[PDB]
């Protein structure tokens, strides 16, 4: 039973937004609603990561808390790549963001950078096995500045998943590896933008943007810790 095929089976299928595509604020207040469920599904995916359950409770709370946006963003890139060849933002099959709702206020800004991730997938022609393998890493790419409460366990699991990207790349070695680790690095760079934009809409209550209790709790915790800056991303460069 092959790891890479096993990844293929657990990867979440895409949620629908179930949206009435007939306002700059509903549009955001929908995406958060959706997002909350995605995070649910990404947690079930998390539990069903080989070796993930190896990690200690806190660390799991943490890795998810820290990389959650990242994974969400990454996969949105994948969708937008496979679905419109980089052309629109595809959140769910019903909710496609074209150039018309990009002109929706507030909104141009954050969405360029969601398309820029996808742009990376375009330029690089990433295969599916590759995608899966990297995403596993994003989960293990964002960690506290002050160690991890199972640092040895981690380092092993993280390595496992790299050797795994090795196999995945070989299937399609070692001039290409560079490029993708440069992309795995530049995620923390580009996600850090969305996370900000996220915290804005969150605490500036006078924008009447809604986030489901799921997202609510994770952000309200994750917010102060990230604001001071207790977070070091594991890079390759």
């Amino acid at each position: 039973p092959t790891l890479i095929s096993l990844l293929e089976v657990i990867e979440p299928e895409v949620l629908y937004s179930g949206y009435d595509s007939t306002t700059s604020t509903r549009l955001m207040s929908t995406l958060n609603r959706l997002g909350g469920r995605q995070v649910v599904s990404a947690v079930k995916w998390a539990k069903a990561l080989p070796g993930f359950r190896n990690l200690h409770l806190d660390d799991q709370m943490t890795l998810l808390q820290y990389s959650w946006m990242s994974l969400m963003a990454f996969s949105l890139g994948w969708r937008s790549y496979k679905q419109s060849n980089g052309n629109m933002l595809c959140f769910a099959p019903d909710l496609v963001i074209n150039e018309e709702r990009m002109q929706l206020p507030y909104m141009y800004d954050q969405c360029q950078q969601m398309l820029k991730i996808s742009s990376e997938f375009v330029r690089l022609q990433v295969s599916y096995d590759e995608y899966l393998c990297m995403k596993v890493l994003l989960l293990l790419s964002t960690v506290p500045k002050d160690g991890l409460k199972s640092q040895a366990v981690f380092d092993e699991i993280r390595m496992t998943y790299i050797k795994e990207l090795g196999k995945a790349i070989v299937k399609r070695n070692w001039q290409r590896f560079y490029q993708l680790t440069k992309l795995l690095d530049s995620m923390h760079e580009m996600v850090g933008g969305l996370l900000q934009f996220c915290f804005y809409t969150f605490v500036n209550k006078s924008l009447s943007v809604e986030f489901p209790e799921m997202l609510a709790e994770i952000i309200s915790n994750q917010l102060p810790k990230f604001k001071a800056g207790s977070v070091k991303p594991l890079l390759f460069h």
């Binding site: 947690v43 709370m61 808390q65 709790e217 994770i218 309200s220 994750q222």
Partner: peptide, 10 residues
Amino acid sequence: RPAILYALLS
């Protein structure tokens, strides 16, 4: 500290 997230892994 996040309630739902927790009850997931616990």
